[model samples]
Target: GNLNIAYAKPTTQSSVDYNGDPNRAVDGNRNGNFNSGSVTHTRADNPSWWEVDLKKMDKVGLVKIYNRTDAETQRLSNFDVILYDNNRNEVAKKHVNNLSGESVSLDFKEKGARYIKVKLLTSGVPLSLAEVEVFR
Candidate 1:
């Protein structure tokens, strides 16, 4: 059976803003409405980022990231979804220009990775996410 390994996993971000802690993204709640208290937010930084540590290396086939739907959705653009191994080496990466929909899915095709990160390339923009799901 498929499983969301990212659920309730250890998470962190560059900074915290509006009480939207990093762990919110891995809480298994896909509610895009930030006010619903299920989203993550970071302070406006040059390169904001959010990451999840899977605790152990696993076969990662896909990653789904949910965007905040209330507003400021544009801030979630020009980012990269990167995968890293247990030894902190880059495994794979994907670039996203914008969020055309409420969410974006990245195909890893069973790459071995223990950490997944979403980083914004644009400067001085806060980062926020509703949820992140990883599966094998």
Candidate 2:
């Protein structure tokens, strides 16, 4: 069965001059704001989780995640991929300990699912992403 899911795409710009300053913790987007009370880490590994509603149950075969690297500097090194079903049940997951290229694809056996959730598991590292493409 063919299924259409709602997926959110991350922005291309993923860099902030979060120097060791109490006032300047994050730059660019306001959502990147961080607390300045405690010791701040240079690498901000915030997992941008996106959700997709399939609207109906269907067999999902493959899911692709697109990582947008800016030039050669802003590249992702390590992260984890998680998927959940409509009832918030764990379905499939893959840990990308290290990403060398820009685009990566994950193939899986056909599984019934009504919703898909992608969670990025990491810390102290800037994640640059462009789009998340999934196939079923």
Candidate 3:
């Protein structure tokens, strides 16, 4: 991504930050360790969410999400990696559940989104992301 737009772009979440700031999620560092301040955290709430506003319509081919690895890896389980347009209409989406690796990529066949949202459909877990890297 020549833009690096997410690195300091606007970010919003459902709850207040009980840990690292929301901006850290797009800070361009997949530091691997959550305690290293690579994560953006929100309070424990149902359907906890963290979203990014790319500010402009983007190519948005791929979305790579880094999950917390320090502990309770299950907290990052069962979610929707969704893409939306400026109107917040669904552009693309992938339902992600039990996984293995700390990172996962959602590739779109033919769509783009100005907004990217990670909604925890499993509930009862705060939203934590070491990073959210996007590609066009």
Candidate 4:
């Protein structure tokens, strides 16, 4: 079977700009800024998410995520990977944590799906992802 992979990118914003956005009202402390800084002390309460369609049901083998190093503060620290079938039914879910590099991989049971959704649960801290790749 042929394997296919997809990538997603995140938006970048400075601390002031992030705090000024009304959509970020959920940020209680007003510290969750999507900018270039240190991730150790910053917080990214509700980061953005991205997804891709596989177009059809196929056996998935490996999932890889590429982290971006451009924004030191907006690094990707944790996330959730979701696989869905043609009907938009969730087939699998994987939680990733404490990531600090350019890539991360996960292997799951041979499941059939037509779409893949990767949610950047937490951002502006330690894990700013640049891209996501899925293989079958």
Per-model CA lDDT versus the true structure: 0.94, 0.45, 0.82, 0.52
RMSD for each model, in Å, please? 0.9, 9.8, 1.7, 9.4
Model 2 clash number: 2
Backbone clash total, candidate 3: 0
Greater lDDT among 2 and 3 belongs to 3
Q: For residues 36-59, could you state the per-residue lDDT of candidate 4 as single tens digits?
A: 221112134355454556556778
Q: Number of backbone collisions per candidate, in order?
A: 0, 2, 0, 6
Query: Which whole-number lDDT from 0 to 100 does residue 75 have in model 2?
Result: 39
Worst 10 residues of 4 by lDDT: 21-30
Deviation of model 2 at 103, angstroms: 0.6
- Could you tell which candidate, 2 or 4, scores higher by TM-score? 4
Pitting candidate 1 against candidate 3, the one with the higher lDDT is 1
Residue 74 of candidate 2: its Cα lDDT? 36
TM-score of every candidate relative to the true structure: 0.97, 0.56, 0.90, 0.60
| Backbone clash pairs in model 4 (N, Cα, C under 3 Å; residues 3+ apart or in different chains), count | 6
Candidate 3 — which residues are off by over 4 angstroms?
1-5
Residues forming the 10-long window of minimal summed lDDT in candidate 1: 1-10
Tens-place lDDT digits, model 2, residues 55-81: 666677676554433332233445555
**Residues 44-122 of candidate 1: C-alpha lDDT, one tens digit per residue:** 9878999999999999988999999999989899999999999989999999999889999989999999999999999
- List pairs with backbone clashes in candidate 4: 75-126, 75-127, 75-128, 76-127, 76-128, 77-127
